[PDB]
Structure formats: C-alpha cells, structure tokens
Amino acid sequence: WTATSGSCKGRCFELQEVGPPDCRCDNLCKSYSSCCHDFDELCLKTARGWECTKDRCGEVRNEENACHCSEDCLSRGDCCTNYQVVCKGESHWVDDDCEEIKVPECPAGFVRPPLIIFSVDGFRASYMKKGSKVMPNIEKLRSCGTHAPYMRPVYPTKTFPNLYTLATGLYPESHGIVGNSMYDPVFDASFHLRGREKFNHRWWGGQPLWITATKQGVRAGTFFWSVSIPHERRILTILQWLSLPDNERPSVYAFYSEQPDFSGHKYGPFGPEMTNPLREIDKTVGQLMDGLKQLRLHRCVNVIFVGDHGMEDVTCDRTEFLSNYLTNVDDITLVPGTLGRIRAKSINNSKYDPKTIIAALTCKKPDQHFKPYMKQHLPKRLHYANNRRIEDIHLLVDRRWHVARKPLDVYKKCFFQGDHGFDNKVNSMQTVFVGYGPTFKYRTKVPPFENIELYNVMCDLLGLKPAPNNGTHGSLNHLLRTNTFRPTMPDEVSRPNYPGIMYLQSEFDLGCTCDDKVENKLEELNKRLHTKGSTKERHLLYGRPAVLYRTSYDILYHTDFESGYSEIFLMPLWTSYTISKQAEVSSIPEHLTNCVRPDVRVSPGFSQNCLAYKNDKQMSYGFLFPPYLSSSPEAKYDAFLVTNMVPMYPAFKRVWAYFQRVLVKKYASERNGVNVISGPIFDYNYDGLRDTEDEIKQYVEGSSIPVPTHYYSIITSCLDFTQPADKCDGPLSVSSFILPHRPDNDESCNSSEDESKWVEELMKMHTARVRDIEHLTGLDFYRKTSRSYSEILTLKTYLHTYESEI
Ligand SMILES: *[C@@H]1O[C@H](CO)[C@@H](O[C@@H]2O[C@H](CO)[C@@H](O[C@@H]3O[C@H](CO[C@H]4O[C@H](CO)[C@@H](O)[C@H](O[C@H]5O[C@H](CO)[C@@H](O)[C@H](O)[C@@H]5O[C@H]5O[C@H](CO)[C@@H](O)[C@H](O)[C@@H]5O)[C@@H]4O)[C@@H](O)[C@H](O[C@H]4O[C@H](CO)[C@@H](O)[C@H](O)[C@@H]4O[C@H]4O[C@H](CO)[C@@H](O)[C@H](O)[C@@H]4O)[C@@H]3O)[C@H](O)[C@H]2NC(C)=O)[C@H](O)[C@H]1NC(C)=O
Ligand SMILES: O=C(OCc1ccc(OC(F)(F)F)cc1)N1C[C@@H]2CN(C(=O)[C@@H]3CCc4[nH]nnc4C3)C[C@H]2C1
Ligand SMILES: [Ca+2]
Ligand SMILES: [Cl-]
Ligand code: NA
Ligand code: NA
Ligand SMILES: [Zn+2]
C-alpha cells in the first residue's frame, strides 16, 4: 500500500528515491501507482504547450505553464527550449555553422563535461541516409560529430537485452536479460514486458553505468522514463537538472524514445507512415540542443545518439508453426516470434526428449525458415548460452519470418508489419551511433563497432573505472579527442620450450606408419636450419601468440609452418603459416595417404597415437597445416607429423578439407597472400572461455587425446591488397571463424551436395572476432606489429559479417 497523502511540491522528478516517506515523485512512481495526489498537477504541467510565442515574451511568470517565457526563466532554468530564439533574436542550434569543439566550454563550477545519452528504440542504421532530408538536427550531430555507418546490437536484437548491454558492457548471457520474456528456473519466476516482476532486482546483473557513476562519486539522472511522460517534459526535466547547484547536479543523463520502434512495428521499417516519427524525433533533438545552447552548454556536453536495434519487414503470413513439425506440440512451451526458445511444458514429463524434438525440426521443409540448435551449437559470436534463463533448444529464425507454436497463437492472440530480434549480423537489425561534443572527434567517421564496447567509452567520458565487462577497452580510442584508455598488452604467463631432436624413431610405439624411409650435405644443412626457425619470419608475421595461462608447451619450427604444441592437450594450441598469392595446391601422394610420422623433438608420452584413431570408429583425424599447401615434395613430409594431427569427425573433415584445399588458396589470390593461424578450441561448458583439462567431456576412445568442440582460423592480410601479406607496411585486414566440431552436418541442409554448395555458407555463419578466439583459447595474438596497440585492439574486435553494404 502507498499512503499517497504526501506532496510533490518542490520534489518533482526527485533523483533520490523514497520508500519510508510514503509518496513518490520520480519518473517511475507511475509504474508503481505510487505518485502523490498532486504529481500530475505539479510535475506534468501542459498549460500553453511547449513553445514560446512573440506575445509570451517578457510575460509575468505563471507557475501553471508547462514552460516559461519570462525574463527570470534562464536562471531558474525552465524556459521553453525556443525562448531565446523567439524572444531574444537567437538562431536555432541547427541553423548555426558547426565549429570544432576543441575543449569543453562549460560554465564555472562544472567539474567535467556532462554526458547525455539520447537513445532511440528501433532506429535502423539506414534511417541516417534514407531519412536525412527530414532529420536536420540529427544530420548535423552526425556530420559534425563522430559517427559509425552502423552499430552492431547484441542477440537477441530486442529492446531490454540491448539497452542493458549498452548500460553494462555485457553480453545478455552475463547480464541476465536474455530476452523480452524469460523464465528463471532457479527462482521459478517469469519476466514479462508487462507487469511487476521485471522490476525485481534479481533479473539485472553486472553493474550498469548509473551504479558505476554513483559508486565513484559521479551523480546520475534517472535512466528509466514512464511511457506517459511526454518527450518535451523529458527534455525540460534534463534541462532543469542541468541547472541544479554544482553539488546536486548529475553529470550523466539518459533520454529514451519509444519511436521509431512503435510505428515501425505497425507500418514496417519504411512504411510511408514512418516519415512523421522520424520528423518528431529530430524535433526533440532540436529542443535539446536549443535548450543546451540557451544554457551555454552546447559546446560543453557530450551527446551520444544511439539505437538499441533496427527493424525488419515481418507479416503474419510469414510464420512457421511448430504444429506442422511436431506431433507432441502440447508438451512444449515456446518463447515465440523472431527467435524461438523451447522447453518442456512440465518438468514431470519423463517422455520429453530434446533429441527427438531437434530431429523433428531439422531440415523438414524445402525452404524451412528457421533452424533448430542446442544452445551450445549456436554460432559462438552470438555469445548466447551461458545462462540458465536460455533454454537448451533454440530456433534461429530467418529474417522477415516468425515462429509460433500453432496457428491459433497468431490469429487468437494482420496487425504488425515490422519486427526485430533476429541474428545480430542481419543488416536490417543494425542500429546507429553518433557522438558529439568536446571529448568526441570532429567530422570523423569510424568503422562499425559492437554496442558492448560503449560502456567503456561512457566510463572514459565520465572519468570512471568501468566494472569488468565484455568490451575491449581501448578498441574505441579512435572515437575520442582525449580521455583515451591506454592499456598494456597482457603479460605472457607461460614461456615456451624449444625442443631439438631428442628421440629415436624406435622409441615410438604409436601404431602409426609412413612410407617415408627413402633417402646430401647441401639440403641437410638446409632442413636443419628450417627446423631451427629460419623461415619463421615468413610464417609468423605478427610475432608468436602469448600464452596467458599456466601450461607446458613447445614451439616447433618447420619449412612451411610454425606451431605452439601443447604437451597437456597433446596437440597444437596454434599453428601459423603464410600462403602467398603465387602459392600452389598439390595433392597428397599415394604413398603418403595414411602416413603419420613420429616427431623426434617430442616424447612418445606427449604424442597422439594412430591406434586410438583406429579403435575409435566415430573419430578420425586431420591436420592443422594442410599437406595440400606444402612448398615442395620434401617439405610435405612435415605436414604428416603426429604433432600436426588433430581429432576430427569424418563429417567435419568434409568442411575442413574444403577450407584447406580450396578456400585458403582462394583467399590468398583475392587478398594478395594470407597468413593463417589455426587451432583447436575446447568449450564444453559453453561459457565462451578456454576449458581447463578437467572440463573436457570427450576423448578419443582409449586415450587422453581431448576432442575439441571447435576449430578456429584467423586469416590476416594487408588492408592495402596491392601489398603482399608478408610485406605489408600499414593496417591489417582480418577475417576469422570458429567452426563447431560436429559429428554430423545436420546444421547444413544442403550437405549431401558438393562442398562448393554448402561449406562456405556454414563458415560465414560461424564468422568470429579474433577477440572471441582469444577468450576461447587463452592466447593473445598480434603481439609484434608496427601498429598502435589501440589499432590492434580495433582489429581484434572486427567481425566480417558477409552482408552486402548497409
Ligand atoms: C563477459 O564479462 C564478464 C564480466 O567480466 C565475465 O563474467 C565473469 O566471468 C567470471 C569467470 O567465469 C566470473 O567469475 C566467477 O565469479 C563467481 C562469483 O560471482 C558473483 O559475484 C560477482 C561479483 O559481484 C557477480 O558479478 C556475479 O554475478 C553473476 O551471477 C549472478 C547470479 O548470482 C547474476 O545475477 C549475474 O548476472 C552474473 O551471472 C553470470 O555469471 C555467472 C557466473 O559467475 C553465471 O552462472 C551466469 O549464468 C551469468 O553468466 C556473482 O554474483 C565465483 O563464484 C566464481 O568462482 C568459482 O570458480 C573459480 C574459477 O577460478 C574457482 O577458483 C572458485 O573456487 C569458484 O569455484 C567454486 O564454485 C563453483 C561453482 O559454484 C564450484 O563448482 C567449485 O567447486 C567451487 O566451490 C568465479 O570467480 C564472474 O562472476 C563473471 N561476472 C559476470 C558479471 O558475469 C564473462 O566471462 C565475459 N564473457 C566472455 C565470453 O569473455
Ligand atoms: O527510459 C527508458 O530507458 C532509458 C535508458 C537509456 C539508455 C540506457 O542505456 C545506457 F545506459 F547505456 F545509456 C538504458 C536505459 N526506458 C527503456 C524501457 C524499454 N521499455 C519497454 O520495453 C516497455 C516495458 C513496459 C511495457 N509494457 N508494455 N510494453 C512495454 C515496453 C520501457 C522503456 C523506458
Ligand atoms: Ca569453457
Ligand atoms: Cl525474447
Ligand atoms: Na577412427
Ligand atoms: Na545436412
Ligand atoms: Zn520493438
């Protein structure tokens, strides 16, 4: 109960919340039905509207008015935003030339430039260009400030997961808001867009910007705004707050608009009805900037204009129904729409089996517009598994489509023409970023980046130490005039061994065989040099990766490749090699088909053996450096060493062989040479982090050879492709992947066809950031370049999406 007998007089939009004194006056009391009786009268005044008029100029103060045009309004800080324009002959901010803001120009007593985050729901990246004619204030922020062509949201591309990612720098799986609708089995509680439960503190993990600020002595305005408070009032409140005394004034503020998302849902992303919402948003930005200009704060405040996600065309007729696939449809619960999450309707149902469900949903229709996954098999780049609120069974839905449980759910819930929530690499889901102010750069375009990076930057903008998060701090230094964060490269934890020839052939009883025993001082001194590392400068272009955890490993040198070989995991952690544009593909000779050779630098006890592979009817083996790309017939023997071998399912060998035999050479030709680092990944607990030895759930039968969950490759070349990969003077170009190591190709519906028809599509889906691979391997790449460390960090966060231009 709320005894709302108290008063909001002098308390409107109070920053500090109240419990004991019964009545509340903050922009959140509406959501609790706990506002003072006089809240509306005192705090939501509307009289005379939102703009000054010529006749209102100089008027006597009338406290009933929504905003003021009297002479005293400026010092009081409550003028209508157009006051100086209408009454004092000033120009609107949008009509002023832009001028570089080299330094904050703030009133006396401002300790730091304030930050205002202007966030817009459903603001698709392409609106910046397509709506540019009707959005002059936003176009000025964009062209005069720092802007990306687009910003990548997190999956799912829903409002709460994204806004809370912006606030925390965390993947949804870590912050816990993994959808707009959620069931937590530990609390036995449901989170819904509508209602009370979403306000419970237990849903919201990590440390959002406002708590980071408060704990470090920096005051914050409220982030959440009640839906019925009009945008003009939201603006005027922020402007009022900015006029508070030094000791009370917040340094960080948030505005939120329900538009253009609200209209996009009803009309689609480019419905003709979409022009007006874009116009209204721009008008709100104008009121803010005019308002700042009035307060002499328009060259003081840093302003971020940011979206949560974009918007796609989706209509009722484009719905797949699980009732068309399952006979058991009433035994499951589905979280429906632009993603699917399935669990058992009842945890008492012993007959429920996720395996039969997955099978019944796999490639059953010609043009199936969703694909089923166990969550740990979803593309690693989505970081969407490590939370008990994410159901084991997930459906990735094609863009433009919906999944539902049965037709009644869709016609007894066509209204909507737009939706969002799809895979975060989908172009229509891309959103916006503009930064404008003394701390951002002037007239600067930056490459697209992910929204997980912004928390760190907002901390930099406010002088805060960020809480631990999923951004890569420093990777956005190129957005900033000053306040850059300059990290040091992490220290290597394990130094490598450099073994020479220590074992005789006969010491190895591995059950391996090779027709290699066919016999010169010219080329024998030459091969010893290669084994000492004489070609290493060619195949290790960016220095060796640092191992950031305690382990035992060897560096192994060869003519065509170098590797860091793990004595603990009995395989390389990484294998590095350069393939030039002129390089040639050769076949595996007949006498070498099933050849595996003991490596005389590495003990039998730290080697794989062929007998385990023979015994394991499910498991076969592949090579990290591809024999097909050896530089000569003599060098090819190196690719058959037991230390270059890794466990592979025959189904995965089809993918891997096509990558190695076909695609590497294709990249080398397209990119003017490529450097490749490949290796295994072990993530059995699907937390996105390197497993320790005691977390491994599968070994090659009868052995201690651990089975990877994934294979990565990092493919680097010169950004200026007129320069060969191995002779590059400037910035680099990278694409990488994390392929799931699976015993079937059920993921690829076209897989009974030639690899040329399905493998590259699989790899595109499993595209990855170098940073994703770092977390997963405990390695740190690009240690020795001539490039700035921040530039390298940006490169490590790059994701090659394979979407056409936005
Ligand atoms: C993205 O960035 C984030 C942030 O950096 C990374 O997440 C971190 O990963 C760390 C490494 O795994 C993890 O560290 C653990 O912390 C445990 C204590 O955690 C609590 O306290 C912190 C600090 O305030 C808080 O942040 C946590 O909040 C989590 O949990 C609450 C629920 O209570 C959620 O509301 C919240 O959203 C968040 O959940 C997320 O993380 C947890 C895991 O912590 C997941 O379960 C959730 O699904 C969700 O993803 C907590 O309130 C601490 O107990 C751990 O220590 C164990 O393991 C170490 C290994 O070194 C071992 O030495 C210890 O002995 C201990 O083991 C003991 O417990 C085991 C399990 O109970 C048991 O099996 C053993 O036998 C032992 O008895 C560990 O140090 C850190 O918590 C999170 N932080 C966050 C915010 O998520 C993330 O890795 C990044 N992602 C990528 C891909 O890079
Ligand atoms: O005012 C706000 O957000 C400020 C902010 C800015 C930047 C942020 O990020 C950063 F901190 F980084 F700046 C975070 C928050 N919000 C965001 C909420 C999303 N929302 C909803 O989704 C409704 C839920 C109740 C409901 N019932 N039926 N339909 C709904 C939909 C209500 C909005 C009010
Ligand atoms: Ca792991
Ligand atoms: Cl959801
Ligand atoms: Na086998
Ligand atoms: Na298939
Ligand atoms: Zn929406």
Curated annotation (Swiss-Prot):
Organism per entry: Rattus norvegicus
Notes on the domains: The nuclease-like domain is most probably catalytically inactive as residues that are essential for catalysis in the DNA/RNA non-specific endonucleases are not conserved. However, it is required for the stability of the protein and the catalytic activity born by the Phosphodiesterase domain.
Entry similarity comment: Belongs to the nucleotide pyrophosphatase/phosphodiesterase family.
Localization of this protein: Secreted
Residues spanned by motif Cell attachment site: 76-78
UniProt activity-regulation remark: Inhibited by vanadate. Inhibited by micromolar levels of bile salts, such as tauroursodeoxycholate. Not inhibited by taurodeoxycholate. Not inhibited by hydroxysterols, such as 7-hydroxycholesterol, testosterone, dexamethasone and prednisolone. Inhibited by EDTA and EGTA.
Gene that encodes the chain: Enpp2
Recorded coiled-coil stretches: none
UniProt enzyme class: hydrolase
Species lineage: Eukaryota, Metazoa, Chordata, Craniata, Vertebrata
Descriptive protein name: Autotaxin
Effect on the protein upon substituting T159A: Abolishes lysophospholipase D activity
